[PDB]
């Protein structure tokens, strides 16, 4: 989980909460359920 | 290591193309069901993940 | 991106022009932005 | 479609039956909106009369160029002159000049023959256009012209003729036979207005009246001619003193400085398409639940503008 | 004499706040790692070409560099920009001046206006009839040379003055050193931090 | 002559010759504001 990273605007700025209609939906299973 | 999913995205196709202009929104309706079939395809991709 | 419109900011076209030309200048943005969204959804369908 | 979330869903799906599921709905909500206008509080009136009522305009081989700045630009009182036989604009439509605002404006002024008027346009060619008055093909501005036979005929060989906005003068220099008996052989006065739309602070702004500055509501705003539809909010953005606007990663405008007092306001869209409707089938219930995506529950009434819904 | 200018001569290309973002822009910039001409004001102020525009910087502790002249002939045949700083206010004018045969400051018109230890930096460029001045100030630790380190110049003034400039000259106080580098049209990638500030770039 | 409308309306009036320019959909002025404005999407003919 620590070895995969972000530096990339369209995700990392949305995760940092972009408003031009683009959004990220959560997965149905949380990382704790996986 | 194997990939299994990718980040689920939703694009609000009217707010992307027209940015809350009513004038552009009325022009975008003249393109018909292009905007709903983009939302349908991204929803199908999102449920696939 | 302009896609051949007088500005890429849609509010410039709406504030500077009037419908006889503004609907054509906005249609260049709608055409280009919609083709740019179709390109994203197509490559995401192939990546999915 | 604006009744309730199930109706917004039925309209999103173009269907009266809805199958059991979660549907991400298209915004059919009313968002009633009001306009806001916020030009600078400037009090000088622009000196366009020192062009249009000048005793003599220049000869078109050596045209004059007035600079207009730091003033209210009533284009409408100019446009209300009965004299103007032709009035064209490019990159602006003349109806909007009343409602629009610029950083500087240049007015070029000269006389030509009535036959030659058609040469003064973006991308034209000919014995005036290519040789002593050339417009840019990417121009943004207006061309105004009228017959001046009553002013500038006598003939009046004191009037003379010979890159974009180039002035150049052996010479090819020639004189006009302007006589009162001349139909296209009459003198025509012409003025060419050129607008600086670069992102510096505006200084040449239409007769439009400024309003109070409504925060925290969906407004069809206008600062310095930068219109939009959105919610205006105070923000922590550290603008440097010379910066007038701010932009998102899309290079779309995201913040502004009020010209009347130097506070910084963020802009946010009103729409909020981030709604999903959880439904059993309509062949089971008309009841629904609504998911407002990513929002905090204490902020939902503000995020969807529920007080005006 | 010359020295190699490292990454000096970056400036804010437009009057827009951008933050936490990388922006590609094409503008007249000083090329990176490029040879700039080095001059001493003690024991010299020639007339240079202006080319497309000038990055200028003075290394100073004395304020002997006090102004600049820009034009073509510098002899009253045509308009010339004059800029003076007297350490109480800044004076700017564009008249058809008859300057000295060797211009210095003692120890027809249109536009007229009034408002080593140190590096003072300036950029002068002249586009669409607007003469644009950018600047920055910092302490430094070397007498010979420009500092090996990044900084971005910000707008000082914009003059709507319309001159067809081809030549340039600095003004010295007479009865300190400076550097001249010509700009070129370059695509740059600019890095804006959270505080809206340009903090790195690529030529 | 191949068209066949539900109704047709002839708007009829006199103006000064320099103002014939103003009787066009995209225009404004003391005729095309205070006394005779066309629709911006007008379908019809202007004969003067």
Swiss-Prot record, chain C:
Changing residue 2 to K: In strain: Omicron/BA.1, Omicron/BA.2, Omicron/BA.2.12.1, Omicron/BA.2.75, Omicron/BA.4, Omicron/BA.5, Omicron/BQ.1.1, Omicron/XBB.1.5, Omicron/EG.5.1. It comes from the Viruses. Changing residue 15 to A: In strain: Alpha/B.1.1.7. Subunit of the fusion protein that is processed upon entry into the host cell. Mediates fusion of the virion and cellular membranes by functioning as a class I viral fusion protein. Contains a viral fusion peptide that is unmasked after S2 cleavage. This cleavage can occur at the cell membrane by host TMPRSS2 or during endocytosis by host CSTL. In either case, this triggers an extensive and irreversible conformational change that leads to fusion of the viral envelope with the cellular cytoplasmic membrane, releasing viral genomic RNA into the host cell cytoplasm. This is Spike protein S2'. The chain holds residues 968 to 1015 of 1273 of the full protein.
Swiss-Prot record, chain F:
Residues 16-18 are annotated as: Integrin-binding motif. It comes from the Viruses. Binds to host ACE2. RBD also interacts with the N-linked glycan on 'Asn-90' of ACE2. Cleavage of S generates a polybasic C-terminal sequence on S1 that binds to host Neuropilin-1 (NRP1) and Neuropilin-2 (NRP2) receptors. Interacts with host integrin alpha-5/beta-1 (ITGA5:ITGB1) and with ACE2 in complex with integrin alpha-5/beta-1 (ITGA5:ITGB1). May interact via cytoplasmic c-terminus with M protein. May interact (via N-terminus) with host bilirubin and biliverdin, thereby preventing antibody binding to the SARS-CoV-2 spike NTD via an allosteric mechanism. Attaches the virion to the cell membrane by interacting with host receptor, initiating the infection. The major receptor is host ACE2. When S2/S2' has been cleaved, binding to the receptor triggers direct fusion at the cell membrane. When S2/S2' has not been cleaved, binding to the receptor results in internalization of the virus by endocytosis using host TFRC and GRM2 and leading to fusion of the virion membrane with the host endosomal membrane. Alternatively, may use NRP1/NRP2 and integrin as entry receptors. This is Spike protein S1. The gene is S. The chain holds residues 388 to 435 of 1273 of the full protein.
